[PDB]
Amino acid sequence: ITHYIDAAQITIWAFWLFFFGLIIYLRREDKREGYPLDSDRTERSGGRVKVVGFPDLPDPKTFVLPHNGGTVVAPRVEAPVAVNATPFSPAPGSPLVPNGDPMLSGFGPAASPDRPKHCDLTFEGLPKIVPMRVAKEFSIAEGDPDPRGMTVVGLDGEVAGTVSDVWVDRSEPQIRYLEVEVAANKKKVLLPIGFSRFDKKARKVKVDAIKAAHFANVPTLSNPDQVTLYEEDKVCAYYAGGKLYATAERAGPLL
Amino acid sequence: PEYQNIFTAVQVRAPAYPGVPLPKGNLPRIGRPIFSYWLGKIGDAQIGPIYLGLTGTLSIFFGLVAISIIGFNMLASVHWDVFQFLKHFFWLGLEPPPPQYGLRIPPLSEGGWWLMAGLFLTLSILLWWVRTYKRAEALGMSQHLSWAFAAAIFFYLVLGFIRPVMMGSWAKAVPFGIFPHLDWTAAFSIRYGNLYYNPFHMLSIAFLYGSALLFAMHGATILSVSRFGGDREIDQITHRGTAAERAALFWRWTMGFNVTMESIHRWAWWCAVLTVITAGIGILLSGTVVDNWYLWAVKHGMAPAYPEVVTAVNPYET
Amino acid sequence: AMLSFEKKYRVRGGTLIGGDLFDFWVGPFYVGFFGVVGFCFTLLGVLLIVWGATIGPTGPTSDLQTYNLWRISIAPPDLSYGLRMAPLTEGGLWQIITICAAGAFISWALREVEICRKLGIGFHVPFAFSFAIGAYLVLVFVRPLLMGAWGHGFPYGILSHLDWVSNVGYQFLHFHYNPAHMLAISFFFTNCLALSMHGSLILSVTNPQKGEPVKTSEHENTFFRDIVGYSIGALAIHRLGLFLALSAAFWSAVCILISGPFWTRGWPEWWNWWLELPLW
Amino acid sequence: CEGPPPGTEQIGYRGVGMENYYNKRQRALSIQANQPVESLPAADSTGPKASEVYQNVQVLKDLSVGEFTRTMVAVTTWVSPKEGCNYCHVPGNWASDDIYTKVVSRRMFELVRAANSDWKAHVAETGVTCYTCHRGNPVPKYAWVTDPGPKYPSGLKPTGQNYGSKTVAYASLPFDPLTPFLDQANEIRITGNAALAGSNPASLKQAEWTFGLMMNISDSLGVGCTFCHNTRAFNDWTQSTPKRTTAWYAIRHVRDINQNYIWPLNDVLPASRKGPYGDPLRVSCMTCHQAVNKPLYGAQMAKDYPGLYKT
Amino acid sequence: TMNANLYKIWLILDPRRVLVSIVAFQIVLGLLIHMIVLSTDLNWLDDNIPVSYQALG
Amino acid sequence: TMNANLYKIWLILDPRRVLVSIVAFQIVLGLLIHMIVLSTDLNWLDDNIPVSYQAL
Amino acid sequence: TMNANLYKIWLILDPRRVLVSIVAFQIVLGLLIHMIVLSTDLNWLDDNIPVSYQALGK
Amino acid sequence: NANLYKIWLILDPRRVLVSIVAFQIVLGLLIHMIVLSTDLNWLDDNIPVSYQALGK
Ligand SMILES: CCCCCCCCCCCCCCCCCC(=O)OC[C@H](COP(=O)([O-])OCC(O)COP(=O)([O-])OC[C@@H](COC(=O)CCCCCCCCCCCCCCCCC)OC(=O)CCCCCCCCCCCCCCCCC)OC(=O)CCCCCCCCCCCCCCCCC
Ligand code: BCL
Ligand code: BCL
Ligand SMILES: CC[C@H]1c2cc3[nH]c4c(c3C)C(=O)[C@H](C(=O)OC)c4c3nc(cc4[nH]c(cc(n2)[C@@H]1C)c(C(C)=O)c4C)[C@@H](C)[C@@H]3CCC(=O)OC/C=C(/C)CCC[C@H](C)CCC[C@H](C)CCCC(C)C
Ligand SMILES: CC[C@H]1c2cc3[nH]c4c(c3C)C(=O)[C@H](C(=O)OC)c4c3nc(cc4[nH]c(cc(n2)[C@@H]1C)c(C(C)=O)c4C)[C@@H](C)[C@@H]3CCC(=O)OC/C=C(\C)CCC[C@H](C)CCC[C@H](C)CCCC(C)C
Ligand SMILES: COC(C)(C)C/C=C/C(C)=C/C=C/C(C)=C/C=C/C(C)=C/C=C\C=C(C)\C=C\C=C(C)\C=C\C=C(C)\C=C\CC(C)(C)OC
Ligand SMILES: [Ca+2]
Ligand SMILES: [Ca+2]
Ligand SMILES: [Ca+2]
Ligand SMILES: [Ca+2]
Ligand SMILES: [Ca+2]
Ligand SMILES: [Fe+3]
């Protein structure tokens, strides 16, 4: 006989039911960081009103860290952290302007969270990211230049210093930072590989992010032979601030 | 200018990693690892070692038999003439049994080799599935890969096994060959009245496109924050860094919402898996439930209508 | 509203055009100059699509006008109009919507560039999005231009554009044999495998078996070395995924760009250069 | 590789994508390669009929002697210009049928007359001459025989496919669709007429044979599928072009030519005119069309020869 | 003629891997040989011996 | 004609890898040869010798 | 006419890497040449010489 | 030229040998395959006799 309902139509409707359930599942997972939202509705409600949208936040999950590193929970209540900036306009949706010298403000592309003050570890439990002085089993791959001894230049072509060592990932072998002995103050600062272009024939490392004189203020390591997560983010964020702050033209606009 | 983190400019080397130790009962790994400088320009320079126990050994044996049965028949189909085998390679194939044999085991001379290649590739794949499960178990990892692999195996099984059995004939399965399996794809759509109007075909396309959309988005996002260590997603997930924060804000500011460093991989996981889930269902319903997808789409009110600017007299009516 | 960590990133400047004039957010969305411009192109295009649905192909009173979501179709002009502008009711509406879409798409990408400048992040995402835009522009601009009529563009209809794809494909008898098309599909398929592999591995090491700690980079490398004897690496897997997705888009554009402008016969017959080589 | 711009033609409604593309330079050289031989001057149509002047005229009975002679001159240029009259005639005896080419040619006259008079649903008023197929060659360049395909070892049955074959326009589809469909009359339709399964036993392998035939048809006329189909519904006559109706009759026309005109000549044709299976060189779409949508780009040759029509 | 020091082969090839590879090889060979013969005149399942059971219905 | 110092080849080529490769090559070669012969007139399985076993 | 110092070739090329390559090449060339010959009139398997063994059973 | 021997001061003797050996084998295979594709084919030319005919 004939029927309007058929199995293809039944099954496709069943898929939509599954799919929309999946979307709500995924949107719940998406809210394990950064939520509840910082709004002006939560300010005026005296905190009574938490902005979370739909769906609401999931029940917290736990991450068990190896080597007795502790437990991470998600979502989590995070203490508000002051913003080192003042609004360009008091109207909602206005940007803010960094206080003081922008490079040193910790705001905008110079900003970063406060990551943990411990070192990422290898499976065996050693500090993962270390200089080649310490991980003596590492070498430069034949065919490529040794960055040690290369000259570090800033965005304006001025000599910022010399590469004094190379910091490698012991878990998954690669250069993560160059160690730069800064000419101006003889301090040794990290330089992320993400901000480094090699000019191999010149044996020069070019850093477009900052000027030569900006190298004096790269955040410094508490311990010269290892790097904490906290210090990794502070280092990378300082170079990144230069992308917007290091010269006047970088503010924009084009027209 | 800036470093884009596409190629590794300066590779470093260390003695090869033998791998995380596995529990008792796993076999020792085999192979002496080597380094490729050129693989090391785009990714990891180490090749090897590899694990190979009974599951993978049985899998590879089934798989080599299956692949050789295919190639042998291809070479036989140009009468052992190796030059004509190279000339015609993309056209050659191993053809399913004729429809007259139904689901019975067909003769060696006319379809038996296809059924054997199909049986042993299928067993080879099923054993490879177990391999993906066991390698995660030995490392203490969850089974996300084997779940996604099962979804691909489902689609594979529907194409060559489930649907042909449902339809009562190995002749409705897929031939083994490059261009021959493209013929099968086009002929399947023709026979079943235009696969574009199969709604699970439409969904499967949405998810295949979405996989490229999502990996372009995610791939590009991570490289742009790799300057902040964003490629190290384990510690960005447990200890959110400015990499994970800047990534979410790029997307939040672009399109109004965002996910997390962990949950993008869930979006990615489901998008890819649903590509082959919907594909299996679409093929599973073709011939078994719906014989003409266009007329099925007409029936449910979906097919567009156009002004008539061409038309043809049906000579079967006259 | 803002993410609980967002306020410290909402910095002034980094615009390409506009400066202080449009430098503000609207809820989560950043606007800026290309936000304003893109919004106008988008709302116009969407409203003109709905107007085309309202009047249909032959007027709102005909039986062909429909708001059925699968059946709504706004079509390009007849090929006889060449590279000229057709009347609004004879495909010109499609032509204006196309320009809105291109303007909407390009404005979206440039807005993304301004966002990257604010966040001090790389420009990979707008660069990658440019490949999708390029493919759209190959479809509605370059390929129609090389063949001499905007009417070679595809219609804007959820199912009607599949009819366009179908009939354009079968103009070449057996479109599956397009070499750039085969290559592009290989990239589309390989991308999907790679995406499922990547998603699975990250979820499986951060969500290990009960009682297990979070797994390590060493687990990730070991895991695929154990299965396939090779691990590309956690950075390189993101390199690979971007390469596969962009390659799929690029060869898509190539495969349709050569279908008409650079090849007019069946696609299987293209392979006769191989068959006719003096080796066999 | 080809260079833009191509020639283009719109076939269907705007945006449906039914469009034809061709290379302008190849079209110009094809037009040069499909020139029609200029028709002979008209002859006096008076005097006695050929039926009463000559001794063994069985087909061209009602032509005047002038129109009959004119026809013999024409067929010589169309079929055997290098050899001349004696390609079909015993020297010194025009009436004798004791040479195989004359016996064949007599049936060819009936073939053409049947085509020009009875198959206008196909050949319209344009019609065909000997030249349409022969092109100045006794043996048509684009005749065909059943194709045995590549050699197999004795313990493996040939598949009839999965091979690079020009006959299906270099697809790996079943590479001999001519024998089952343009000689024999196997069913070409496979698309179902109901949405839901239950009443269509056609098979995927039948779809591949049909698809292979359509490559050959398309390739023989130099067109894409959209010349005759809207490919969102290949089976739907209401969305097809009138060329599909024409193609339907042409398939039956081709079947009539091979079964009733060519095949009965097999025993009198020399072995050189036969394929490995003993079958005679015979007729497909390519034989007349020769990669043009109309033979000779639609040149009207038959109309200047009254002897090329029935009664 | 077997060699008296043949046992020293297990000083060369790993006994466990040999065992694993033989088991794997023989499972494949067993399935492969059964299937080849089923695709020939020797087939014992569809030979209607001792009877055809599809005809009793 | 063989050399008296031919045993020194095991100072050059690893005995372990050579043995594994030999049995792998011989097993694959033997499968291949059985395949070739079955696909020819020499087929001993489908030759109906001593009898055809497919009864009506 | 070979050179007296030709043995010095094993000072330049690794004898081990050379021996494995020759074995692999010779195996493949042997397989390749056998197949080419089988594809021609020279076929010694399907030539029904001395007799055709399938006729014996059909 | 008298100083041509210095070419081995510029180009690695070991890779050049390997490249020459690799190139010559492929070329030899290529040329045989080309000639066997033409009228010059000496294998399927039924010369001195057709052996398949000998078996019919
Ligand atoms: C013929 C078939 C041939 C197949 C051949 C295959 C060959 C292999 C054969 C062997 C197979 C063995 C299978 C596994 C064995 C045991 C594995 C194991 O370790 O188990 C313990 C395992 C681990 O325990 P655990 O403590 O959770 O550990 C998790 C980790 O800590 C870490 O976990 P986590 O934190 O990552 O979370 C896990 C994850 C869980 O995800 C998975 O693990 C499974 C993923 C799915 C795979 C299958 C695809 C499903 C396709 C559905 C679409 C079909 C269309 C029709 C729709 C019908 C549904 C209505 O969480 C989610 O993703 C949540 C998903 C929510 C589902 C969607 C949400 C909406 C549901 C409906 C909403 C309400 C509807 C109305 C709403 C109204 C308002 C809108 O137990 C689980 O809880 C996970 C279950 C997964 C295993 C079984 C399912 C996957 C494997 C089979 C897939 C087969 C695909 C074929 C589909 C065919 C077409 C339909
Ligand atoms: C009509 C064509 C002829 C024929 C013509 C030839 C000719 C001509 C030759 C062969 C040779 C060989 N043939 Mg044949 N061959 C025929 C039919 C067959 C059939 C078959 C099922 O019908 C088989 C399985 C074989 C098999 C073989 C191999 C034994 C050998 C090549 C091995 C190789 O490449 O080593 C490569 C591996 C290495 C170089 C590594 C080092 C060698 C090791 C140390 C020794 C291995 C065993 C050795 C090959 C023994 C050869 C002994 C006899 C002379 C056969 N022939 C038919 C009847 N065959 C070749 C041969 O005899 O070579 C000496 C050869 O020149
Ligand atoms: C007209 C058709 C002729 C014919 C015409 C020719 C001609 C002409 C030539 C060959 C050449 C070759 N032919 Mg032929 N050939 C025919 C039939 C055959 C058949 C066959 C199954 O019918 C086979 C297998 C071969 C095989 C071969 C090789 C022996 C040789 C290519 C070696 C090479 O590439 O070295 C490349 C590798 C290297 C240079 C590496 C360095 C040295 C190596 C390590 C030592 C190799 C030893 C060498 C092969 C010894 C053989 C010399 C003999 C005089 C044959 N010929 C027919 C009968 N053939 C070539 C030749 O004789 O070369 C001297 C050549 O120029
Ligand atoms: C989300 C859907 C997508 C998807 C998912 C998917 N596929 C998967 C997985 C997942 C999650 C796996 O875990 C699995 C895998 O292991 O990937 C790393 C797999 C896989 N997907 C594969 C392919 C694949 N996936 C495809 C598609 C897709 N996969 C999707 C689009 C396709 C397409 C597009 O058609 C292909 C071709 C394989 C790479 C792998 C399954 C491998 C497998 O089953 O292997 C056993 C089979 C064999 C034939 C083994 C043969 C052995 C080889 C010939 C090696 C020979 C070795 C020998 C020792 C050499 C000795 C010689 C000496 C001389 C040295
Ligand atoms: C290049 C590899 C792949 C890719 C990557 C890519 N796409 C991207 C990005 C990247 C990197 C973004 O950053 C960007 C984004 O922000 O995503 C969330 C985007 C995006 N890719 C999108 C879509 C998408 N990408 C696709 C494909 C692909 N994108 C690739 C295969 C497709 C396919 C295959 O069809 C679509 C559907 C959007 C989600 C988003 C861009 C959003 C945007 O530009 O918003 C402004 C425009 C509107 C809101 C609508 C404009 C309306 C028009 C004015 C009128 C409509 C005209 C239209 C032509 C009609 C079409 C009708 C019918 C066809 C149904
Ligand atoms: C001579 O060659 C040598 C030996 C040198 C090696 C060379 C090999 C080569 C070149 C091989 C080339 C292979 C190629 C090009 C293969 C291409 C394959 C493609 C594109 C395949 C695509 C799709 C195929 C599919 C989807 C097939 C699916 C089939 C299935 C699932 C069949 C299952 C059958 C089963 C489970 C049978 C069971 C038997 C039962 C139990 C029913 O018995 C009664
Ligand atoms: Ca086929
Ligand atoms: Ca029995
Ligand atoms: Ca026997
Ligand atoms: Ca013999
Ligand atoms: Ca010869
Ligand atoms: Fe990732």
Author numbering:
A (entry chain H): 5 to 259
B (entry chain M): 2 to 319
C (entry chain L): 2 to 281
D (entry chain C): 23 to 333
E (entry chain Q): 3 to 59
F (entry chain S): 3 to 58
G (entry chain U): 3 to 60
H (entry chain W): 5 to 60
Give verbatim excerpts from the published study on this entry:
In purple phototrophic bacteria, the cyclic electron transport chain is composed of three major components, two membrane-embedded protein complexes—reaction center (RC) and cytochrome (Cyt) bc1—and a group of soluble proteins that shuttle electrons between the RC and Cyt bc1 complexes. In most purple bacteria, the RC contains a tightly bound multi-heme Cyt subunit that functions as the immediate electron donor to the special pair bacteriochlorophylls (BChl) and as an acceptor from the soluble carriers. Both the HiPIP and LH1-RC were isolated from the thermophilic purple sulfur bacterium Thermochromatium (Tch.) tepidum (γ-Proteobacteria)11 and their individual structures have been determined to high resolutions.
Most sidechains of HiPIP residues could be modeled based on the electron density map with higher accuracies for the interface residues because of their lower B-factors. The interface between the two proteins displayed a zigzag shape in which the large sidechains of Tyr76 and Trp116 of the Cyt subunit and Phe48 of HiPIP likely function as shape-recognition residues. The closest distance between the two proteins was 2.3 Å as measured for the hydroxyl oxygen of Thr79 (HiPIP) and the aromatic nitrogen of Trp116 (Cyt subunit) which form a strong hydrogen bond. The heme-1 macrocycle displayed a significantly bent conformation along the diagonal of pyrrole rings I and III compared to that of heme-1 in the free LH1-RC.
